[PDB]
Write a protein that binds this ligand. Sequence first.
Ligand SMILES: *c1nc(F)c(C#N)cc1F
Ligand SMILES: *c1nc(F)c(C#N)cc1F
Ligand SMILES: *c1nc(F)c(C#N)cc1F
Ligand SMILES: *c1nc(F)c(C#N)cc1F
Ligand SMILES: [Zn+2]
Length: 191
Amino acid sequence: SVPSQKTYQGSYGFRLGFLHSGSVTCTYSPALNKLFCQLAKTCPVQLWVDSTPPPGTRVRAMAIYKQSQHMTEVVRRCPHHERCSDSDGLAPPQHLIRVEGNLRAEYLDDRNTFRHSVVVPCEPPESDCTTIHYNYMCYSSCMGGMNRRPILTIITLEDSSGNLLGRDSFEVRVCACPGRDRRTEEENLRK
Ligand SMILES: *c1nc(F)c(C#N)cc1F
Ligand SMILES: *c1nc(F)c(C#N)cc1F
Ligand SMILES: *c1nc(F)c(C#N)cc1F
Ligand SMILES: *c1nc(F)c(C#N)cc1F
Ligand SMILES: [Zn+2]
């Protein structure tokens, strides 16, 4: 089974956004639709809707491998990092993606597909945007985990039953030098 990655604004006009960045622990490339971040550092992601969704609407994040030959493999923390004593009290140690600073985050191990995801209630903005803070708890290069394979994060807006209301996505590289790696990959896209 493979989760869909098709962008879908839906009835509420749902989409993601990133603030600008160029020392950096996280930086987003619009040209590559790709977030570059350090291990276990805050990644702020903005959520936009055109219209306020109903109470009980939630926002779920899930990682999948980007390459088609790995898409059925569950993205999980590597054998090293899953044994770290780095629990926040809520995230199970196998989950790559955490939400920080939200006590209502729930973590799902899907009983059928075995995929991991983290979901929070969707709340109205303060402002014009809602921000969620994600952490990525493994490097892209971790052997026995992502093993240098690219991943996508899929962000879904869902009703209280889990039915799809909206979807957006971005590629992620978790690496020691996000600013340098962004500049290298944007230069490759240029040439
Ligand atoms: C890290 N990464 C980003 F993409 C942003 C933005 N916008 C902020 C940050 F700290
Ligand atoms: C996992 N957990 C830790 F606590 C450390 C340290 N120090 C490293 C690690 F990979
Ligand atoms: C989630 N939930 C909401 F209520 C809004 C609004 N308004 C945005 C969102 F991303
Ligand atoms: C705040 N948050 C967002 F996600 C967008 C977009 N797209 C715009 C905004 F002002
Ligand atoms: Zn790891």
